[PDB]
Amino acid sequence: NLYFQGSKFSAKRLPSTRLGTFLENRVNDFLRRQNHPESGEVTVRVVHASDKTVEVKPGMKARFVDSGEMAESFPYRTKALFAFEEIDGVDLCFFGMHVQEYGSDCPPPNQRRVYISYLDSVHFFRPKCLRTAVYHEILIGYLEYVKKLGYTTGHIWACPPSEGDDYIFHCHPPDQKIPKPKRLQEWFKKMLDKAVSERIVHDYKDIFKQATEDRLTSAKELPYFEGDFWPNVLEESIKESSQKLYATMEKHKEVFFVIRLIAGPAANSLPPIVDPDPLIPCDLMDGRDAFLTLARDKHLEFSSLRRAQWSTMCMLVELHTQ
Ligand SMILES: CC(C)(COP(=O)(O)OP(=O)(O)OC[C@H]1O[C@@H](n2cnc3c(N)ncnc32)[C@H](O)[C@@H]1OP(=O)(O)O)[C@@H](O)C(=O)NCCC(=O)NCCS
Ligand SMILES: Cc1[nH]c2ccccc2c1-c1ncc(C(F)(F)F)cc1Cl
């Protein structure tokens, strides 16, 4: 075999991580209990991990940071992970997700939280009848894994991409339907209800219920995440001027899930979060832009199985080499 088409550049030979091994073990265990003949071995790899900070934007800084009520910035670790399936000997990249992990050495209100910035997929998983179930196993495992390290809360924003935009994979298949907000909200509910039944998630609530239950009064109590809706909405509210906050939360409450992983009394005694995986510098996978940019420029579409496999191979070579 030619050098770049050799096994050295396969998904499997990408460096292993504790998180990657955990997710894939869980996915392949679910797959072996199904005993479906056309399914292939799944590989999950964390391909980027780096320390970042999210600084509070000027309006909120003015109101809350200079007055001493709120830290000016929050440290977090961003991770990029991808799921691959071998389809009769060929690696296919079918799912990806970037997350933001705010640890125990982080000020409130962001302490011990994970945020799913971006998630995306391409619908060639074989067999197609286990596709949704596998996406759910990955998400559930992610939540279980971070619970076990000592993250207490998770945060999901269910916004589908506007028509024609791609979140991670350049050029989806034209026959891959994009769900409307309702269908996506239900999809997340189904996943979370399964996580709840496994006693991974204690419970979840939309942001309006949660705020009510928390008797939240100030905007400084909201988690402040990189690239999220809510920091832009507050800069919008400040530049032009609790009545307007709750009103805005109620309005978008279906779209934002607060996921409680560790509950009440247990969440105060927690030891410090120790992440046993290393940092993994990889500029290609530092947020979603770099990979969209490369794939646009080099014409690496994910728009058919065969384009997706070529695109996957180029992706892999690049991760192995940078
Ligand atoms: C989120 C995502 C992984 C869900 O994939 P999934 O498990 O296949 O579930 P979907 O809701 O997309 O599809 C399930 C079914 O609903 C159908 N469906 C999806 N959108 C539809 C629409 N607008 N109208 C009718 N049917 C639709 C699909 O065709 C599919 O039918 P099938 O099961 O018979 O094949 C995928 O839709 C996706 O990658 N979306 C873009 C990324 C994203 O939305 N991220 C948001 C959070 S950051
Ligand atoms: C800011 C933000 N960004 C999000 C992104 C995804 C999911 C949830 C949130 C939230 C949120 N989290 C907690 C509360 C609450 F607990 F205070 F109610 C309120 C809010 Cl709006």
Side-chain angles (χ1 to χ4, degrees), residues 176-179 181-210:
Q176 183 170 330
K177 298 200 180 62
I178 298 311
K182 177 54 177 195
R183 172 186 289 284
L184 186 61
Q185 291 153 20
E186 292 306 317
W187 191 91
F188 280 118
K189 277 184 199 157
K190 190 166 122 74
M191 182 276 296
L192 297 168
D193 295 336
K194 184 162 207 277
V196 171
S197 69
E198 291 195 57
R199 310 293 175 260
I200 294 169
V201 170
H202 192 266
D203 56 12
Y204 61 96
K205 316 186 231 226
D206 68 50
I207 48 166
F208 178 75
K209 195 82 74 65
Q210 189 73 54

Short mmCIF file of all heavy atoms in Angstrom, two decimals, residues 176-210, unseen atoms left out:
data_model
loop_
_atom_site.label_atom_id
_atom_site.label_comp_id
_atom_site.label_asym_id
_atom_site.label_seq_id
_atom_site.Cartn_x
_atom_site.Cartn_y
_atom_site.Cartn_z
N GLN A 176 -29.48 14.63 3.53
CA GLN A 176 -29.49 14.66 5.02
C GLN A 176 -30.34 15.81 5.48
O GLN A 176 -29.91 16.96 5.44
CB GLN A 176 -28.09 14.74 5.65
CG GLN A 176 -28.08 14.69 7.19
CD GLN A 176 -26.68 14.52 7.79
OE1 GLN A 176 -25.80 13.91 7.17
NE2 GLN A 176 -26.48 15.02 9.02
N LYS A 177 -31.54 15.48 5.97
CA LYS A 177 -32.48 16.48 6.46
C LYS A 177 -31.91 17.12 7.71
O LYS A 177 -31.22 16.45 8.49
CB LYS A 177 -33.85 15.86 6.73
CG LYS A 177 -34.50 15.26 5.48
CD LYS A 177 -36.00 15.11 5.66
CE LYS A 177 -36.66 14.51 4.43
NZ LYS A 177 -36.16 13.14 4.12
N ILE A 178 -32.18 18.42 7.86
CA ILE A 178 -31.82 19.18 9.04
C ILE A 178 -33.06 19.23 9.91
O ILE A 178 -34.12 19.61 9.44
CB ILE A 178 -31.36 20.62 8.68
CG1 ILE A 178 -30.10 20.60 7.79
CG2 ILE A 178 -31.16 21.49 9.92
CD1 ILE A 178 -28.97 19.71 8.28
N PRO A 179 -32.95 18.83 11.18
CA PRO A 179 -34.16 18.86 11.99
C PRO A 179 -34.57 20.30 12.32
O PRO A 179 -33.72 21.17 12.41
CB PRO A 179 -33.77 18.06 13.24
CG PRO A 179 -32.29 18.18 13.32
CD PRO A 179 -31.82 18.22 11.90
N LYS A 180 -35.87 20.51 12.45
CA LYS A 180 -36.41 21.77 12.94
C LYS A 180 -36.19 21.77 14.47
O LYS A 180 -35.99 20.71 15.08
CB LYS A 180 -37.91 21.92 12.58
N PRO A 181 -36.21 22.95 15.09
CA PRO A 181 -35.95 23.07 16.52
C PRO A 181 -36.71 22.06 17.39
O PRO A 181 -36.12 21.48 18.29
CB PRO A 181 -36.40 24.50 16.82
CG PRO A 181 -36.06 25.24 15.56
CD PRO A 181 -36.44 24.27 14.47
N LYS A 182 -37.98 21.81 17.09
CA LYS A 182 -38.78 20.90 17.88
C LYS A 182 -38.25 19.49 17.84
O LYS A 182 -38.05 18.86 18.88
CB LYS A 182 -40.24 20.90 17.41
CG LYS A 182 -41.17 19.93 18.14
CD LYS A 182 -41.15 20.11 19.66
CE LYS A 182 -42.15 19.17 20.31
NZ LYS A 182 -42.46 19.51 21.72
N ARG A 183 -38.01 18.98 16.64
CA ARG A 183 -37.46 17.65 16.50
C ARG A 183 -36.10 17.52 17.23
O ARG A 183 -35.84 16.49 17.85
CB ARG A 183 -37.35 17.29 15.03
CG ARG A 183 -36.61 16.00 14.73
CD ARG A 183 -36.44 15.82 13.24
NE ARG A 183 -37.69 15.51 12.58
CZ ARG A 183 -38.30 14.33 12.61
NH1 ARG A 183 -37.80 13.30 13.29
NH2 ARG A 183 -39.44 14.18 11.95
N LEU A 184 -35.27 18.56 17.21
CA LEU A 184 -33.95 18.52 17.90
C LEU A 184 -34.07 18.58 19.41
O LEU A 184 -33.28 18.00 20.12
CB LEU A 184 -33.05 19.68 17.43
CG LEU A 184 -31.58 19.73 17.92
CD1 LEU A 184 -30.76 18.51 17.51
CD2 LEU A 184 -30.89 21.01 17.47
N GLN A 185 -35.05 19.32 19.90
CA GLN A 185 -35.32 19.41 21.33
C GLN A 185 -35.77 18.06 21.84
O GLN A 185 -35.30 17.60 22.87
CB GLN A 185 -36.37 20.48 21.62
CG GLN A 185 -35.83 21.88 21.34
CD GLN A 185 -36.91 22.90 20.96
OE1 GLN A 185 -38.09 22.70 21.24
NE2 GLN A 185 -36.49 24.01 20.31
N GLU A 186 -36.66 17.40 21.10
CA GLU A 186 -37.07 16.05 21.47
C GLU A 186 -35.92 15.04 21.41
O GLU A 186 -35.80 14.18 22.27
CB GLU A 186 -38.26 15.56 20.59
CG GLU A 186 -39.59 16.29 20.84
CD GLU A 186 -40.02 16.28 22.30
OE1 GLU A 186 -39.89 15.21 22.95
OE2 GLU A 186 -40.44 17.34 22.82
N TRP A 187 -35.07 15.15 20.40
CA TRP A 187 -33.89 14.27 20.26
C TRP A 187 -32.98 14.34 21.52
O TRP A 187 -32.50 13.34 22.02
CB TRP A 187 -33.13 14.69 18.99
CG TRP A 187 -32.05 13.81 18.51
CD1 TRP A 187 -32.16 12.79 17.61
CD2 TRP A 187 -30.66 13.87 18.85
NE1 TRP A 187 -30.93 12.20 17.39
CE2 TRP A 187 -30.00 12.85 18.14
CE3 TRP A 187 -29.92 14.69 19.70
CZ2 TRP A 187 -28.62 12.63 18.23
CZ3 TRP A 187 -28.54 14.48 19.79
CH2 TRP A 187 -27.91 13.45 19.06
N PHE A 188 -32.75 15.55 22.00
CA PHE A 188 -31.97 15.74 23.22
C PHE A 188 -32.69 15.21 24.47
O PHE A 188 -32.02 14.68 25.37
CB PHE A 188 -31.61 17.21 23.43
CG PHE A 188 -30.44 17.66 22.63
CD1 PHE A 188 -30.57 18.67 21.66
CD2 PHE A 188 -29.19 17.11 22.85
CE1 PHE A 188 -29.49 19.10 20.95
CE2 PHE A 188 -28.11 17.53 22.10
CZ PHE A 188 -28.26 18.52 21.16
N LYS A 189 -34.02 15.37 24.50
CA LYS A 189 -34.83 14.84 25.61
C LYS A 189 -34.72 13.33 25.72
O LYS A 189 -34.49 12.79 26.80
CB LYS A 189 -36.31 15.22 25.46
CG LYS A 189 -36.64 16.61 25.97
CD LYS A 189 -38.13 16.89 25.89
CE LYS A 189 -38.43 18.38 25.95
NZ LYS A 189 -39.76 18.69 25.33
N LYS A 190 -34.83 12.66 24.58
CA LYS A 190 -34.71 11.20 24.48
C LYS A 190 -33.33 10.72 25.02
O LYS A 190 -33.23 9.66 25.70
CB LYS A 190 -34.98 10.75 23.04
CG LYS A 190 -35.13 9.25 22.81
CD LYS A 190 -35.75 8.91 21.44
CE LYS A 190 -34.87 8.00 20.55
NZ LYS A 190 -34.80 6.57 20.95
N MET A 191 -32.30 11.50 24.74
CA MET A 191 -30.95 11.12 25.12
C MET A 191 -30.83 11.28 26.62
O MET A 191 -30.43 10.37 27.32
CB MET A 191 -29.93 11.98 24.36
CG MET A 191 -28.47 11.67 24.61
SD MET A 191 -27.90 12.52 26.07
CE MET A 191 -28.08 14.23 25.56
N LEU A 192 -31.18 12.47 27.09
CA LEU A 192 -31.18 12.74 28.48
C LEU A 192 -32.07 11.77 29.31
O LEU A 192 -31.65 11.31 30.38
CB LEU A 192 -31.55 14.21 28.71
CG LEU A 192 -30.52 15.18 28.10
CD1 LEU A 192 -31.12 16.57 28.12
CD2 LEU A 192 -29.14 15.18 28.76
N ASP A 193 -33.27 11.43 28.84
CA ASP A 193 -34.11 10.46 29.57
C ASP A 193 -33.44 9.11 29.70
O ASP A 193 -33.57 8.47 30.73
CB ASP A 193 -35.52 10.29 28.95
CG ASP A 193 -36.36 11.57 29.04
OD1 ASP A 193 -36.08 12.42 29.93
OD2 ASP A 193 -37.29 11.75 28.20
N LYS A 194 -32.68 8.70 28.69
CA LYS A 194 -31.88 7.47 28.79
C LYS A 194 -30.73 7.57 29.80
O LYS A 194 -30.47 6.64 30.56
CB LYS A 194 -31.33 7.08 27.41
CG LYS A 194 -30.56 5.77 27.40
CD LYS A 194 -30.43 5.19 25.98
CE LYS A 194 -30.29 3.66 25.98
NZ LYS A 194 -28.88 3.16 26.20
N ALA A 195 -30.04 8.72 29.79
CA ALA A 195 -29.01 9.05 30.77
C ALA A 195 -29.59 9.12 32.21
O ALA A 195 -28.92 8.73 33.20
CB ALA A 195 -28.35 10.38 30.40
N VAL A 196 -30.80 9.65 32.33
CA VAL A 196 -31.51 9.67 33.60
C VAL A 196 -31.82 8.25 34.10
O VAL A 196 -31.61 7.96 35.27
CB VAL A 196 -32.80 10.52 33.56
CG1 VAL A 196 -33.65 10.35 34.84
CG2 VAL A 196 -32.44 12.00 33.39
N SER A 197 -32.24 7.38 33.20
CA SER A 197 -32.58 5.98 33.58
C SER A 197 -31.40 5.12 34.02
O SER A 197 -31.54 4.22 34.82
CB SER A 197 -33.41 5.30 32.50
OG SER A 197 -32.68 5.05 31.34
N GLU A 198 -30.21 5.46 33.52
CA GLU A 198 -28.95 4.86 33.93
C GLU A 198 -28.38 5.46 35.18
O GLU A 198 -27.32 5.04 35.60
CB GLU A 198 -27.93 5.04 32.81
CG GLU A 198 -28.22 4.22 31.58
CD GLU A 198 -27.03 4.15 30.66
OE1 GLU A 198 -25.93 3.71 31.10
OE2 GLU A 198 -27.18 4.53 29.47
N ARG A 199 -29.07 6.44 35.77
CA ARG A 199 -28.59 7.17 36.95
C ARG A 199 -27.28 7.92 36.67
O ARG A 199 -26.45 8.07 37.55
CB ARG A 199 -28.48 6.26 38.17
CG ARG A 199 -29.71 5.42 38.47
CD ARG A 199 -30.91 6.27 38.89
NE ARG A 199 -32.11 5.43 39.04
CZ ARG A 199 -33.11 5.28 38.16
NH1 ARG A 199 -33.14 5.92 37.00
NH2 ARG A 199 -34.12 4.47 38.45
N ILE A 200 -27.09 8.37 35.43
CA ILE A 200 -25.94 9.17 35.09
C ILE A 200 -26.31 10.62 35.35
O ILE A 200 -25.63 11.28 36.11
CB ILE A 200 -25.47 8.93 33.63
CG1 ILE A 200 -24.96 7.49 33.48
CG2 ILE A 200 -24.41 9.97 33.25
CD1 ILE A 200 -24.73 7.02 32.06
N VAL A 201 -27.40 11.07 34.73
CA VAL A 201 -28.01 12.36 34.95
C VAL A 201 -29.01 12.21 36.08
O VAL A 201 -29.83 11.28 36.05
CB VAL A 201 -28.76 12.85 33.69
CG1 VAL A 201 -29.62 14.09 33.96
CG2 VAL A 201 -27.76 13.14 32.57
N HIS A 202 -28.96 13.13 37.05
CA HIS A 202 -29.92 13.14 38.14
C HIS A 202 -31.29 13.65 37.64
O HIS A 202 -32.34 13.06 37.90
CB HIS A 202 -29.38 14.01 39.28
CG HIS A 202 -30.15 13.89 40.56
ND1 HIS A 202 -31.17 14.75 40.89
CD2 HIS A 202 -30.03 13.02 41.58
CE1 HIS A 202 -31.67 14.40 42.07
NE2 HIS A 202 -30.99 13.36 42.51
N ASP A 203 -31.23 14.77 36.92
CA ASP A 203 -32.36 15.38 36.22
C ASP A 203 -31.91 16.59 35.42
O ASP A 203 -30.78 17.05 35.55
CB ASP A 203 -33.48 15.80 37.17
CG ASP A 203 -33.02 16.73 38.23
OD1 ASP A 203 -31.90 17.29 38.19
OD2 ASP A 203 -33.82 16.90 39.16
N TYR A 204 -32.79 17.08 34.57
CA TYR A 204 -32.53 18.27 33.79
C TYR A 204 -33.75 19.14 33.74
O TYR A 204 -34.86 18.68 34.01
CB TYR A 204 -32.12 17.90 32.38
CG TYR A 204 -33.16 17.14 31.59
CD1 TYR A 204 -34.03 17.78 30.73
CD2 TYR A 204 -33.26 15.77 31.71
CE1 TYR A 204 -34.96 17.06 29.98
CE2 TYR A 204 -34.19 15.04 31.00
CZ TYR A 204 -35.03 15.68 30.13
OH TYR A 204 -35.92 14.91 29.44
N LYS A 205 -33.54 20.40 33.42
CA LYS A 205 -34.63 21.36 33.33
C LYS A 205 -34.26 22.36 32.27
O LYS A 205 -33.09 22.67 32.10
CB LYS A 205 -34.88 22.09 34.66
CG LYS A 205 -34.86 21.19 35.88
CD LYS A 205 -35.24 21.89 37.20
CE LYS A 205 -34.21 21.64 38.31
NZ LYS A 205 -34.85 21.29 39.59
N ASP A 206 -35.26 22.89 31.58
CA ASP A 206 -35.05 24.07 30.80
C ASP A 206 -34.57 25.24 31.69
O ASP A 206 -34.79 25.26 32.91
CB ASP A 206 -36.30 24.41 29.98
CG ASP A 206 -37.48 24.85 30.81
OD1 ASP A 206 -37.29 25.76 31.67
OD2 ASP A 206 -38.63 24.36 30.53
N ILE A 207 -33.90 26.20 31.07
CA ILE A 207 -33.33 27.35 31.79
C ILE A 207 -34.30 28.18 32.60
O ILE A 207 -33.88 28.77 33.58
CB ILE A 207 -32.55 28.28 30.85
CG1 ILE A 207 -33.39 28.59 29.60
CG2 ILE A 207 -31.23 27.64 30.48
CD1 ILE A 207 -32.87 29.75 28.79
N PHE A 208 -35.56 28.26 32.18
CA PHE A 208 -36.58 29.08 32.87
C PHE A 208 -37.01 28.39 34.18
O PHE A 208 -36.95 28.97 35.24
CB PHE A 208 -37.76 29.45 31.93
CG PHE A 208 -38.84 30.26 32.60
CD1 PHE A 208 -38.66 31.61 32.89
CD2 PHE A 208 -40.05 29.66 32.97
CE1 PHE A 208 -39.64 32.35 33.54
CE2 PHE A 208 -41.05 30.40 33.63
CZ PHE A 208 -40.84 31.75 33.92
N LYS A 209 -37.40 27.13 34.10
CA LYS A 209 -37.61 26.33 35.30
C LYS A 209 -36.44 26.40 36.26
O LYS A 209 -36.63 26.62 37.45
CB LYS A 209 -37.86 24.86 34.93
CG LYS A 209 -38.45 24.01 36.05
CD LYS A 209 -39.96 24.17 36.16
CE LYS A 209 -40.73 23.46 35.04
NZ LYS A 209 -40.56 21.98 35.07
N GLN A 210 -35.22 26.23 35.75
CA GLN A 210 -34.02 26.18 36.59
C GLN A 210 -33.77 27.51 37.28
O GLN A 210 -33.49 27.53 38.48
CB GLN A 210 -32.79 25.80 35.76
CG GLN A 210 -31.52 25.51 36.58
CD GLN A 210 -31.61 24.20 37.32
OE1 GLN A 210 -31.88 23.14 36.72
NE2 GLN A 210 -31.39 24.24 38.63
#
